[PDB]
């Protein structure tokens, strides 16, 4: 019994091939975590926010590649906090096919730090904890090669960082964390 949401970064810095690689990664995850009470939802964010499929929409078409293929890149700046709030308030809502007593999981995939966001992580993270949202974060590339940047990852993800934070050099290396991610979701389903 699980409701697995994806909040994918579609900001300008992510080149088309890398956005394609991420979609490929999202698809593969959904295919590997395929269970009879496991629903998936996706929202793309940048400075604009787009729901690509609700849990209800996935229930009526449980084909991962059919739902991920049409996803087009938004481009623009990075407003992660506003994205997290929108996932919590919109994706994890009963009207959008979300289940009341199901496990609330969120995999966040980004290539950079949030900037110029109207919202702070303090305005978004407590609400996610209170709503019982288990957060996983994948920080891609050089943007997370500092101490300050890794703390942003730790802020997004659920405590402890060792069990919820992931880091890859690029989008072509997302394939590397495919197995590790699937196994972490399966540990307390």
């Amino acid at each position, epitope marked *: 019994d699980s409701d697995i949401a994806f909040l994918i970064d579609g900001s300008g810095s992510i080149i088309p091939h890398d956005f394609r690689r991420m979609k490929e990664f999202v698809s593969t995850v959904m295919e590997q975590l395929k269970k009879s009470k496991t629903l998936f939802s996706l929202m793309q964010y940048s*400075e*604009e926010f787009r729901i690509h499929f609700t849990f209800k929409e996935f229930q009526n078409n449980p084909n991962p590649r059919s739902l991920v293929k049409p996803i087009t890149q938004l481009l*623009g700046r990075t407003h992660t906090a506003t994205g997290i709030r929108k996932v919590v308030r919109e994706l994890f809502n009963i009207t959008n096919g979300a289940r009341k007593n199901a496990f609330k999981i969120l995999v966040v995939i980004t290539d950079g*730090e949030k900037f110029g966001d*109207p919202l702070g992580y303090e305005d978004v993270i407590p609400e996610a904890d209170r709503e019982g949202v288990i957060r996983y974060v994948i920080g891609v590339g050089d943007a997370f090669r500092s101490e300050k940047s890794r703390q942003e990852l730790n802020t997004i993800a659920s405590k402890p960082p060792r069990d919820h934070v992931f880091q890859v050099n690029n989008f072509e290396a997302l394939k590397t964390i495919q197995n590790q991610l699937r196994e972490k979701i399966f540990a307390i389903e």
Partner: antibody
Amino acid sequence: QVQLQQSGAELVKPGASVKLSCTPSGFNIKDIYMQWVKQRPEQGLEWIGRIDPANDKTKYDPKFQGKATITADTSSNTAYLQLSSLTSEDTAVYYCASEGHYGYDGYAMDYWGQGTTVTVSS
Amino acid sequence: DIEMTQSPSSLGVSVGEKVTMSCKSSQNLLYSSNQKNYLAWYQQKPGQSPKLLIYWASTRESGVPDRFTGTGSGTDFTLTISSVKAEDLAVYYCQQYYSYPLTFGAGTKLELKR
């Protein structure tokens, strides 16, 4: 050659509405963020809002909330600005500018239109 | 809203001189992930529309002469015109494109001295 072509001068009565257009020759509105900037006589530049013509998503400055409505028409490759309940404060030159997508998280306004004069008078 | 503070509002200039304008933002414009300053400079010649001069605080736009130079980081930014030409007499605006609302400075009008 590559430029933003704006609609002609406007003379409107107060309380009325006006719809300004901006058509780029050389590029697609789908591939840019179309901005709208206000310039009051011998005053500075004042950002109104912008549109993503690829998905019709808009952002405004709350000072223009209720006043301005930015729309896009991909078919005619035109972006629009509608100003409602016109007052003498809306008398200004309105520019359309495009913020291009060059592989970065955001950009500057690299292209600007010639401007459109709006005069509000009874 | 980020405040863009330009100085001086008006500047007396002679042909051949080196001139400098100031633009100070109330908030940081340096994005840590790309190490780029979300600051642009526009030149507005009389009767004409603003034109992009400098972006990323220091990159010159295509066709912009070597005489226009952009410097600064984070909060305090400066535009430099080494050997001023008559064609350079205009209003120079600075703009932040970091967060919404996108804000502009009040400008620096270059006038010829006598």
